[PDB]
């Protein structure tokens, strides 16, 4: 029942924080965003910028997405992001993640009218 | 009839250089390693480290792979990498890429006997 855009926000936006607070950031967020519900989602990235700032990427540098289609866009500037990666030890339902904070360019897949981010392609 | 190990070396290893020479590195390498043969491969990463240093990652930090498997490992130290991303104006056969040189941790998938990298999962 969520739109593609609402789904993108749930999964990948964390405007409320400038950066991953601690080593436990991912353990907390993966769970509160419902990404640990039926199974441990293995990888996920949260962007720490305003929604408008992220929506603006859809008119920035046009690039190929991982699938070869060209509805992907690379941000002009670096953005604050947190990478969450399931660790070796992790066992549903006690899903465990490694938290990495970085300043990188983002690449998103855009769709619709208005043209907004619907998928997180990669960080560079 | 190429081995998984040899395919990983051809598509993801560039030990002969410490880093991407120029802005043109990706255009040249994607073509020489045959990744632009029938189509423009949209994304690719090259690691500028010795084979020995990359094979050693198979015994470093165990993490989940993108696909959920648990035969993935993250290097403890950053390594010299080159990110290749197909631009929005690229049209086969004139595949065009954007070159990004950086120092990042790598995540590889390992298999076989001996236990070596066979797939490049991501850089972090
Ligand atoms: C949270 C999220 O965006 N997951 C995405 C990433 C990946 N994806 C899909 C498309 C269509 C693309 O162009 N590039 C990507 O990286 O798929 C998940 C959704 O299926
Ligand atoms: C050159 C290369 O490694 N391509 C890989 C990237 C991706 N992949 C596969 C597996 C099995 C994995 O665990 N993690 C990945 O990122 O798919 C290509 C394999 O054809």
UniProtKB/Swiss-Prot annotation, chains A, B:
Glycosylation sites recorded in the entry for this protein: 1, 7, 34, 37, 41
Tissues/organs with expression: Pancreas.
Subcellular location: Secreted
Key word Secreted present: yes
Main location: secreted
Effect seen on changing residue 119 to A: Loss of activity
GO terms for biological process, alphabetical: defense response to Gram-positive bacterium
Binding annotation for substrate: 7, 10, 41-45, 66, 85
Single annotated GO MF: lyase activity
Keywords annotated in UniProt: Disulfide bond, Endonuclease, Glycation, Glycoprotein, Hydrolase, Lyase, Nuclease, Secreted, Signal
Active site: 12 (proton acceptor), 119 (proton donor)
A Gene Ontology cellular-component term: extracellular region
Subunit structure: Interacts with and forms tight 1:1 complexes with RNH1. Dimerization of two such complexes may occur. Interaction with RNH1 inhibits this protein. Monomer.
Family, similarity comment: Belongs to the pancreatic ribonuclease family.
Its job: Endonuclease that catalyzes the cleavage of RNA on the 3' side of pyrimidine nucleotides. Acts on single-stranded and double-stranded RNA.
Record protein name field: Ribonuclease pancreatic
Biological source species: Bos taurus
Span within the parent record: 27 to 150 of 150
């Amino acid at each position: 029942k969520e739109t593609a855009a609402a789904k993108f926000e749930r999964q990948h936006m964390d405007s409320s924080t400038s950066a991953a607070s601690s080593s436990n950031y991912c353990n907390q967020m993966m769970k509160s965003r419902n990404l640990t519900k039926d199974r441990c989602k293995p990888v996920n990235t949260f962007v720490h910028e305003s929604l408008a700032d992220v929506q603006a990427v859809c008119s920035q540098k046009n690039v190929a997405c991982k699938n070869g289609q060209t509805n992907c866009y690379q941000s002009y500037s670096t953005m604050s992001i947190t990478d969450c990666r399931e660790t070796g030890s992790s066992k549903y339902p006690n899903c465990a993640y490694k938290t990495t904070q970085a300043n990188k360019h983002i690449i998103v897949a855009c769709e619709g009218n208005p043209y907004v981010p619907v998928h997180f392609d990669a960080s560079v």
